[PDB]
Design a protein around this nucleic acid. Sequence first.
DNA 1: CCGACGTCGCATCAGC
DNA 2: GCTGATGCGA
DNA 3: GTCGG
Length: 329
Amino acid sequence: PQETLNGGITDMLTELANFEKNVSQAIHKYNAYRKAASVIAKYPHKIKSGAEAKKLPGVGTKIAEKIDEFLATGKLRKLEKIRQDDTSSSINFLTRVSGIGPSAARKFVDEGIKTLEDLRKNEDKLNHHQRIGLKYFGDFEKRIPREEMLQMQDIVLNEVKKVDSEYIATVCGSFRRGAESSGDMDVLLTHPSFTSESTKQPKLLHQVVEQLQKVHFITDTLSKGETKFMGVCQLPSKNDEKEYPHRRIDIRLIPKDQYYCGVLYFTGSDIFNKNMRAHALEKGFTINEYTIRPLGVTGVAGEPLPVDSEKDIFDYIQWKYREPKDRSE
DNA sequence: CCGACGTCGCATCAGC
DNA sequence: GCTGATGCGA
DNA sequence: GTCGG
Ligand code: NA
Ligand code: NA
Ligand code: NA
Ligand code: NA
């Protein structure tokens, strides 16, 4: 449907969502509003009343009431008021900086730090992650065209294979499903020498991050441990041409025996994962991001089943293998 | 009425 | 110093 | 805020 159908309603619900999360610190209310906005965004009809909307799963009495108010006046008194509140609007805004959550944002606003400029003047009060979030505030809010993602992938697959031709790397997320743009790059990494019961050699991930920094693809590090890296990268600039914006990239090292459950999971979509998990249970299986296990007649999960491919997972549950392209739900 | 609402790796805080 | 809790992002 | 046991 077109954003013009119920875009006013969905934007309203989404704005309310942020304030719940970033200001009132009510994560479940944040998710209730998003769920409502999502179900409405998918509704192929221009909503005429709150009652009509209440029929959708996730829209209850209160949101129905807010929709009625929005339809009759074109606005919502509570949202209008919070939008004008200097304190709340500032807290909400600061959370847009990666590394600054509801707590840090509240803390900053409390002591008078309300804008990016203010943050700029108070470096010593920002942890490492927050400094990077500030530094690339704008770049991080830009999406990544599929063409750039392909170029990013070329570099990641090439450097990884260069470190050890036995590594197996897979760029997941919506990009793997074929999306035209991405918000970041999610790379799942594995190596035959690493299994659930094998040595976790604290350098399989390090060696890959290192090479990527060596060829100057990775430019900054937000966090990095033995199994997960979260950083920033940037495609090499075309000589005599505008430089590419910095991008967020995460790299996860996963045991080989859990690699494919990981790829399926991190490929999504979220709606698809929910359905697949459902089908799995009714078929006597429990599927999480790590493994797939058989459920006994009493409900006791047995040992994880061997998975050597995504298809293996689909087979266990008697489901035809579906391309990432068709995993929208 | 009233609890659930995905979980977990990493960085950093809070307490001992 | 070490252990557990919290913040944060995904 | 919404759902549901
Ligand atoms: Na409803
Ligand atoms: Na943030
Ligand atoms: Na944010
Ligand atoms: Na080799």
